[PDB]
Amino acid sequence: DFDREIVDIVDYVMNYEITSKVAYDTAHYCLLDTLGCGLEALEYPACKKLLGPIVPGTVVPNGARVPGTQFQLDPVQAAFNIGAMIRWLDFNDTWLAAEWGHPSDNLGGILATADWLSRNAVAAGKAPLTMKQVLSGMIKAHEIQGCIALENAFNRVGLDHVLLVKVASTAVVAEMLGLTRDEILNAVSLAWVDGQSLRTYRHAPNTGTRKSWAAGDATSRAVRLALMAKTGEMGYPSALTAKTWGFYDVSFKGETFRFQRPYGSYVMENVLFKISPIGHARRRADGIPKLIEKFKINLARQFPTRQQQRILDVSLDRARLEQMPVNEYLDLYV
Amino acid sequence: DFDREIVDIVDYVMNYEITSKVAYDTAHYCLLDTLGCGLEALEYPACKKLLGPIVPGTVVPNGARVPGTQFQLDPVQAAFNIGAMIRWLDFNDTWLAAEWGHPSDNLGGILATADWLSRNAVAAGKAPLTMKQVLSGMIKAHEIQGCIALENAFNRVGLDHVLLVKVASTAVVAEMLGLTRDEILNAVSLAWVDGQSLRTYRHAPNTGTRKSWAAGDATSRAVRLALMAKTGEMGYPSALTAKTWGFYDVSFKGETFRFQRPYGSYVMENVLFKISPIGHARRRADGIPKLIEKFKINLARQFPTRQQQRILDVSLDRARLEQMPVNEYLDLYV
Numbered sequence: 291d292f293d294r295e296i297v298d299i300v301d302y303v304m305n306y307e308i309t310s311k312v313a314y315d316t317a318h319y320c321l322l323d324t325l326g327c328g329l330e331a332l333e334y335p336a337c338k339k340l341l342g343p344i345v346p347g348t349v350v351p352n353g354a355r356v357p358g359t360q361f362q363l364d365p366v367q368a369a370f371n372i373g374a375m376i377r378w379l380d381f382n383d384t385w386l387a388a389e390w391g392h393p394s395d396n397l398g399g400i401l402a403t404a405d406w407l408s409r410n411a412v413a414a415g416k417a418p419l420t421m422k423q424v425l426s427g428m429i430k431a432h433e434i435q436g437c438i439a440l441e442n443a444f445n446r447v448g449l450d451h452v453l454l455v456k457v458a459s460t461a462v463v464a465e466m467l468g469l470t471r472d473e474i475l476n477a478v479s480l481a482w483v484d485g486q487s488l489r490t491y492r493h494a495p496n497t498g499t500r501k502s503w504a505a506g507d508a509t510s511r512a513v514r515l516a517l518m519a520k521t522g523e524m525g526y527p528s529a530l531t532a533k534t535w536g537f538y539d540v541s542f543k544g545e546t547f548r549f550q551r552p553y554g555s556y557v558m559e560n561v562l563f564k565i566s567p568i569g570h571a572r573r574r575a576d577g578i579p580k581l582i583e584k585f586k587i588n589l590a591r592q593f594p595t596r597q598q599q600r601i602l603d604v605s606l607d608r609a610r611l612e613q614m615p616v617n618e619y620l621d622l623y624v
Numbered sequence: 625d626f627d628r629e630i631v632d633i634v635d636y637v638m639n640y641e642i643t644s645k646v647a648y649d650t651a652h653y654c655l656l657d658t659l660g661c662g663l664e665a666l667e668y669p670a671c672k673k674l675l676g677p678i679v680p681g682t683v684v685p686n687g688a689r690v691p692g693t694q695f696q697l698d699p700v701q702a703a704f705n706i707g708a709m710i711r712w713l714d715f716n717d718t719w720l721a722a723e724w725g726h727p728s729d730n731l732g733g734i735l736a737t738a739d740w741l742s743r744n745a746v747a748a749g750k751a752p753l754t755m756k757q758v759l760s761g762m763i764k765a766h767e768i769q770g771c772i773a774l775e776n777a778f779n780r781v782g783l784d785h786v787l788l789v790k791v792a793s794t795a796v797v798a799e800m801l802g803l804t805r806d807e808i809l810n811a812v813s814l815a816w817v818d819g820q821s822l823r824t825y826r827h828a829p830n831t832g833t834r835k836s837w838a839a840g841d842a843t844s845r846a847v848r849l850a851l852m853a854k855t856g857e858m859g860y861p862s863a864l865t866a867k868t869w870g871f872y873d874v875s876f877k878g879e880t881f882r883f884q885r886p887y888g889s890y891v892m893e894n895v896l897f898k899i900s901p902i903g904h905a906r907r908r909a910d911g912i913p914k915l916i917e918k919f920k921i922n923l924a925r926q927f928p929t930r931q932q933q934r935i936l937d938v939s940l941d942r943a944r945l946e947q948m949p950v951n952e953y954l955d956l957y958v
Contacts, residue, residue: 339855343847344698364678379758448874483834485783485819490869496860500817514678521673526830535824540782 292475292532296482297545299434300474301463302553303518308429313555316493316574317425319581320383323563324394325623326588327382328375332358333591337378339372352409355404357623358592369513371400373506378522380502384562385432389439389450389593392505393557396431399459399509400424401497401616403466403516408617421619422612427462429558434458436557442547449541452491452508457481459512467516476525480515482537485528494541626809629881629895631769632814633731633791634808637799642763647889650908651759652942653915654717657897659691659727659957660707660922661716666692667925669832671712686743688736691957692926699740703772703847707732707840714836718896719766721830723773725785726839727891733843734758736949737800737850742951753951756946758805763892768792770891776881783875784823786842787900791815793846801850810859811909814849817863917938931956 292601308314330338341356341362354368355361357376362409363371371394376382383394384522401424435458444451457478464477487507491500519525530537530547538544563569563586568577601622604611611619634724642648664673675690677697680804688694688702690709697705707729707820710716717728742752769788778787791812798811819862821841825834853859864871864881873881897903899918902911938945945953 340852340857344700344851345684345687347685348698349683350679364682366678448869464753481832483822483824487819488817488819488869488871488874490863490866490871491641491861493866493869496862496869497864498858498860500814500860518674524832524834525672526824526834528830529824532824532827532830535822535827536781537822537824537828540822558949572714 292525292527293344294562295549296436296475296478298549299457299461299478299554300471302434303430303465304471306430307424308551308555310559311554313429313558314422314425315430315608319430319578320394320558320561320563321397322426322585322605323565323581324376324382324397326585327377327379328372328547329358329592331375331378333376337375337502338555340374341501343367351396352406352413354406354409354419355618355620355624357620360624364512365403365513366517367404368402370503370506371398372402372512373509376505377505378502381580382399384564385436385439385557386562387436387439388441389444389445389451389454391397391435391439391454393432393435393458394428394432395452395455395505396435396459396462396509397428398506399463399512400427400431400466401620403463403513404427404616405620408615412615412617418615418617420612421616423616424616427466429555431458431462432561433553433555433559434461435487436561437549437551437553438547440550445489447542448488450487450492450504455488455505455508456512457488459509460515460546464516464519465514465518469516469519470507472523473519477519478518479525479527479529480518480523482512482597483526486516486541540599544617593623625857626813626861629843629864629883630809630812632883633795633812634653634805636763636768637795637808638805639763640887642674642760642889644889644893647763647892648756648759649942650892650895650946651763652725653912654728654892654895654897655731655759655762656919656939657899657915658710658716658731659932660919661711662706663692663922663926664715665709667711671836674708674837677701681694683694686747687798688739688740688743689733689954689956689958691954695957698738700844700848700851702736702740702935703732704837704840704844705732706736707843707949708837709840711839712836718898719770719773719891720838722777723779723788725769725773725788726793727766727769729789729839730793730796730843731762732767732790733797733846734761734765734800735954737797738845740949741800742949744951746949746951752951754946755950757800757949758950759946761800763889765792765796766891766895767887767889768795768830770883771883771887772881775886776883778820779823781876782822783823784826784838786839787841789842790818792840792848793843794849797847798850799855801854803850803853806859807853807856808908810857811850811853811947813859813861814852814862815846815858815859818845818849820875852874871955905946927957 353362688697
C-alpha cells in the first residue's frame with residue numbers, strides 16, 4: 291500500500307477542481323511571462339548549443355514544437371528544450387519558502403507533452419487539448435512543488451531543489467497522458483527512487499551553467515518516466531518510508547516530509563514575478579501592466595511586427611486564449 | 625584543478641595501452657556471451673514494452689542498430705535498448721567485491737555509440753571503427769567500474785551500484801567520440817554531480833523490474849552526458865572533494881573513495897561467467913566450451929539456421945571478428 295504522501299499527490303492531480311478565478315487569471319500571465327523569457331534566452335549561444343535533437347536530421351511524426359524555431363521533436367527532448375530556455379537567464383517567476391525554486395519550470399514538461407498529444411489527436415480526427423488545460427496543469431504543478439517546499443528544505447541535506455520539479459511534472463503529465471490511478475501512483479513512486487542532482491554547480495568555487503539547465507533536465511525526466519508508466523511499468527510503494535532503503539533514511543536523515551496545509555490554489559495565487567513590491571500578489575494592479583511590456587519587448591526580439599501582432603492578439607485576452615487548441619497557438623510561434 | 629580521482633580515469637582511458645593477450649581473448653568471449661543474453665530477453669514482453677523509439681515511426685539518419693530487430697535509433701535510445709536487454713534476465717558476466725556489479729552492462733553505451741560513429745564515417749567516405757576498438761573499450765570499462773568497486777561499497781550508503789556504470793561509460797564513450805583531455809575531464813565530472821538511483825527496487829518489500837533496467841538507464845545517461853561535453857559544456861573540478869557541496873560530503877559521509885591498485889587489465893582477466901567453479905578464470909578450459917553452446921542456443925532462438933551460421937562464422941574466430949567493421953557485424957544481427 292502506497293506512502294500516504296504519494297496518494298495525496300495522485301488524488302489532488304486526478305480529482306481536484308480549481309474554482310479560483312484569481313488562480314486562473316494569474317496562471318494566464320505566468321504563461322506568457324515564462325514564454326517570453328525563453329525567447330530571450332535564444333540570443334545566447336550557451337543556451338542554443340544545448341538545443342535541437344540529439345542527432346540533427348531526425349524526423350518525429352506529429353512531434354512537439356519548440357517556440358522560436360521550426361524544430362519538431364519527441365515530447366522528451368522538446369521538454370528539455372523549453373525548460374532550459376525559460377530558466378536560462380534567471381528572470382522567470384519565483385517561490386521563496388524553506389526551499390527556493392521556480393514553479394514555472396514545469397511548463398516544459400506540461401507544454402511539450404500537451405502539444406504532442408494535440409497534434410496526434412488532430413491527425414486521428416479526434417478533439418485536441420485546449421490552452422485552458424495547460425494553465426490548469428500549471429496551477430497544479432505550482433501547488434505540489436510549492437507546498438512541499440514550505441517547510442522542507444532539501445539544501446540542508448545537499449540536494450538541488452529541481453527534485454520537486456521531477457516530482458510535480460511526473461504527476462501532472464502522467465494525468466494528462468490519461469493514465470489510471472494505479473499507473474500515476476507507479477509513476478510518482480518511480481520519481482522518488484530516481485537519483486537526485488547535487489547543488490555543487492550552484493556554489494563557489496564550482497558555480498556553472500548547469501544552474502540554468504538542471505530544472506529543464508528534471509521536467510524532461512518527468513516526461514520520460516510518465517511514458518514508462520504508460521507501458522505498465524511497476525511502482526515502488528514504500529519508496530519514501532522504507533526502512534534502510536527508502537528515501538527518508540537515505541537522503542532525509544530519517545526525518546519525515548512535513549506538510550503544513552492541503553493542496554489547493556495557494557501557490558499560483560501568491561507567486562512572485564521578476565518584472566523589473568511590484569511583483570507581489572497585493573500590487574498586481576501596478577505589476578500586471580509592467581509584465582505585459584516585458585512580454586511585448588521579448589516578442590520584438592525574435593519575431594517581426596505582423597507575427598508579434600498576431601501572437602499578441604490571441605494572447606492578451608484570457609478567453610480566446612483559453613479556448614484555443616494548443617497545437618494552433620504554438621504554431622503562431624514558429 | 626581537477627580531483628585526482630577524475631584525472632586518473634581520464635588518463636587511463638586516453639593513454640593506456642592494453643598488452644594482455646589474456647584480456648583481449650576474454651573480452652572476445654564476454655562480447656558474444658552478453659549479446660546472446662540480450663537476444664534471449666526478447667522472448668519476454670516485460671522487456672520488449674520498454675524498447676523501440678519513444679515515438680514509433682521516427683527516422684534517425686545513420687542511427688544505431690538494436691540486434692534482433694530492424695530498429696535504428698539515436699545513440700542514447702539505442703544504448704538503453706541494448707543495456708536493458710543484456711542485463712534483463714540476470715545471466716550476464718559478474719564482478720563481486722566490496723560492491724557487486726555487472727561490468728558487461730557498459731556494452732550498451734560503448735556499442736550503440738560505436739555503431740553510430742561507424743555509419744556515419746562510412747557515409748562521409750571516411751574509415752569506420754573496428755570490432756577490436758570495442759573489446760578495448762569493454763576492457764577499459766570493466767577496469768574503471770571494477771577497481772573502484774574493490775573497496776568502496778555504495779550499498780552501505782543507500783545507493784545503487786549502477787553509479788559506476790554511469791561513470792565508466794561516460795569516460796570511454798567521451799574518448800571514443802574523440803574529445804580532448806579537458807572535455808573528458810568535464811564529462812566525467814558531470815557524471816559525479818548527477819543524481820544517483822537508490823536501490824529500493826532491489827529489496828523486499830519493493831523488489832521490482834527496475835532491477836533489470838537500472839544499469840541500461842545509466843549507460844544511456846553516460847552517452848547523453850558525453851555528447852553534452854561535445855558541445856563545450858563546462859565541468860565541475862572539485863565535484864568529489866568540495867566542502868559541504870561535493871560528493872564525498874553529501875553522499876559518502878565525509879569519507880574518501882579509496883582505490884587500492886592502479887588501473888590496468890585486471891578486471892576483464894578475472895571476471896566471473898554465468899555459464900550454467902567452471903565460470904572462474906582458472907577453469908577456462910572447462911568453461912569456454914560451455915559458453916559457446918550458450919551463445920549457440922541463444923542465436924537459435926531469434927535467428928534462422930543460415931543467419932545463425934553466418935554470424936557464427938565471423939564470431940568464433942578472434943581475428944576475423946577483430947578486423948571487421950562494427951556497422952557490418954551488427955548488420956549480421958538484423
